[PDB]
Design an enzyme around this catalytic site. Structure first.
Site, mmCIF file in Angstrom:
data_model
loop_
_atom_site.group_PDB
_atom_site.id
_atom_site.type_symbol
_atom_site.label_atom_id
_atom_site.label_comp_id
_atom_site.label_asym_id
_atom_site.label_seq_id
_atom_site.Cartn_x
_atom_site.Cartn_y
_atom_site.Cartn_z
ATOM 1 N N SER A 202 0.748 -1.266 0.000
ATOM 2 C CA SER A 202 0.000 0.000 0.000
ATOM 3 C C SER A 202 0.772 1.307 0.000
ATOM 4 O O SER A 202 0.159 2.370 -0.165
ATOM 5 C CB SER A 202 -1.049 0.027 1.126
ATOM 6 O OG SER A 202 -2.180 -0.781 0.817
ATOM 7 N N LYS B 206 0.199 3.963 -2.737
ATOM 8 C CA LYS B 206 -0.916 4.906 -2.789
ATOM 9 C C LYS B 206 -0.498 6.366 -2.691
ATOM 10 O O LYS B 206 -1.194 7.231 -3.215
ATOM 11 C CB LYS B 206 -1.950 4.506 -1.732
ATOM 12 C CG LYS B 206 -2.570 3.147 -2.068
ATOM 13 C CD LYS B 206 -3.470 2.588 -0.963
ATOM 14 C CE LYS B 206 -4.002 1.219 -1.366
ATOM 15 N NZ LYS B 206 -4.797 0.618 -0.261
ATOM 16 N N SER C 67 1.767 3.307 5.419
ATOM 17 C CA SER C 67 2.224 1.936 5.616
ATOM 18 C C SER C 67 1.442 0.986 4.728
ATOM 19 O O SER C 67 0.439 1.358 4.096
ATOM 20 C CB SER C 67 2.045 1.536 7.087
ATOM 21 O OG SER C 67 0.667 1.495 7.447
ATOM 22 N N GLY C 68 1.912 -0.249 4.663
ATOM 23 C CA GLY C 68 1.213 -1.225 3.858
ATOM 24 C C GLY C 68 1.585 -2.629 4.262
ATOM 25 O O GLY C 68 2.652 -2.856 4.840
#
Ligand SMILES: [K+]
Length: 263
Positions: A45, A48, A210-211
């Site tokens: 993520s 993004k 974060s992801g």
């Protein structure tokens, strides 16, 4: 400081997996410390932020409007869409979608925004055009989080991601209005509590994203600093671990604690 590399190596030992790390001076762009700077890791993520940077670029160029309403349906909903699932009949504006994608990591929001800019191919072209010749997006949510070992799809290199984030937040790529909007969305990040934020001293500023993905993939990109002003960028990625989400989070937090200690 090398004492922080000690913690990065400790994380590799604890996670049984590779950890990529960059500490970058926000002002000068100089890499202060690194570990596996030019190895590839799934962005998960964290992409993004790059996505919304491309959206803002189009707004700056008059090709997009933040207030434009996008309509979608059940056909578009993918797993974990906390905000978009509530606005199926109201639609959402471009601005609302970027807020959802970055602050809530809403996956359908990301896919909707990807369509507006031309998809992974165009995000990759945008990145190459601004000087990042290695970061690449190839797929959409949720497949982009597959993290197949050795697969270069949907990956970045820690050093590249760090310098790209610096350009987007403080470079001349986006207008002052857009630069500020992007960092404001990141400062309102709602789902990175167990990571760097958990080790941040009172009064410090942090704007992050974060992801998490399949096969132990985890990552965080951030601009942070004392006195409520960012002064360094930190990028941390790991993939391949069989460890629990809590363990991966603890290791990343410990790296954050050390870089704060040796600031
Ligand atoms: K390297």
């Amino acid at each position: 400081h090398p004492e922080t590399l000690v913690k990065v190596k400790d994380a590799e030992d604890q996670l049984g997996a590779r950890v990529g790390y960059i500490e970058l001076d926000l002002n000068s762009g100089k890499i202060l410390e690194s570990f596996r700077p030019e190895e590839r890791f799934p962005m998960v993520s964290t992409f993004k932020v790059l996505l919304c940077g491309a959206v803002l670029s189009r707004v700056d160029a008059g090709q997009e409007q933040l207030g434009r309403r996008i309509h979608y349906s059940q056909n578009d909903l993918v797993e974990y869409s906390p905000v978009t699932e509530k606005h199926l009949t109201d639609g959402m504006t471009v601005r609302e979608l970027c807020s959802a994608a970055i602050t809530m990591s809403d996956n359908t929001a990301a896919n909707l925004l990807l369509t507006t800019i031309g998809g992974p191919k165009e995000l990759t072209a945008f990145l190459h055009n601004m000087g990042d010749h290695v970061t690449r997006l190839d797929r959409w949510e949720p497949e982009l989080n597959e993290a197949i070992p050795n697969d270069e799809r949907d990956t970045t290199m820690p050093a590249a991601m760090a310098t790209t984030l610096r350009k987007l937040l403080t470079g001349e790529l986006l207008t002052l209005a857009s630069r500020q909007q992007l960092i404001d969305w990141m400062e309102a990040d709602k789902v990175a509590g167990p990571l760097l934020r958990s080790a941040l001293p009172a009064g410090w500023f942090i704007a992050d994203k974060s992801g998490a993905g399949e096969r132990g993939s985890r990552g965080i990109i951030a601009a942070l600093g004392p006195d409520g002003k960012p002064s360094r960028i930190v990028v941390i990625y790991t993939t391949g671990s069989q460890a629990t989400m809590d363990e991966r989070n603890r290791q990343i937090a410990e790296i954050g604690a050390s870089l704060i200690k040796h600031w």
